[PDB]
């Protein structure tokens, strides 16, 4: 049978990560009498962040309060007393030293479970929990208060709402997107490093063979290949995607509903990609072919030619298991 079964798991991405990648937001909860969506996925997205179009402010710039311009402020958390988020690995570890249970996690599950003891709008019995993004540069963990990752269609966005959608910039590269269900274990059982050397292949007959059909685009470098699987990948909103909002939805809020809508994502399984889509890529570093398919890969092949990369993995890093 095939021998490639128990390597070949981790990128079984809809067994393993189980929601979107380029919108995550595979499940809802309540809070105070309302269903909001939220990410599920359980690998990091690595290299993942949110571009605002047209504002300058980061989206790790926590987010406006009281008087503050919204334009001024990002997605993650406001300051706190004492300080929540930003907080670095070691301020986590030293946070939660009397839990054996969190203490000892790897850095980002640690995050992922830090953003999870947050209680929001005051429901301690809510099962709503903020997803999280992780910077390795300085090892902080951001919990992020707006959980929506794309507003960018042709009624609002077209060129005070927020336009913004999710990227893999070069920017990002070490950033890891976290929702409240990474698993512990993600280093064993999701995609990180690209594959040198190596294709994803299909075992069929005692034989690994070639992806019978690819949706080849151009790309300089792995870099812009893995840019292209996650733009392509499992998305749980639609591109260009904008909420239908009554006159009556309007007026009850004392605020711009469109923003707080396509903020908080309010109320969908019509929607979820439960993990399905072109999350997989071989590039081809000589003919520069990003190569693309959405079904699992089951066996590698060894060929110089090619790196094998995956919408969940990271841009840049590579190991080489046929050296």
Partial sequence: GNPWTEYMAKYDIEEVHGSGIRVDLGEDAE??????????????????GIIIENSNTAFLT?????????????????PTEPLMSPM????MRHFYKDNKYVKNLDELTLCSRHAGNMIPDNDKNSNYKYPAVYDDKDKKCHILYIAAQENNGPRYCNKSMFCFRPAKDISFQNYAYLSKNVVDNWEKVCPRKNLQNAKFGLWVDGNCEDIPHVNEFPAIDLFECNKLVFELSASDQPKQYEQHLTDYEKIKEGFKNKNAAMIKSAFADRYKSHGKGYNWGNYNTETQKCEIFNVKPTCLINNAAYIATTALSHPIEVENNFP
């Fill in 31 to 48: 809070v105070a009498g309302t269903q909001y969506r939220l990410p599920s996925g359980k690998c990091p997205v690595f290299g993942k």
């Fill in 88 to 91: 670095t690995l070691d301020e």
């Fill in 62 to 78: 926590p987010v406006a309060t009281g008087n503050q311009y919204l334009k001024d402020g990002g997605f993650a958390f406001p």
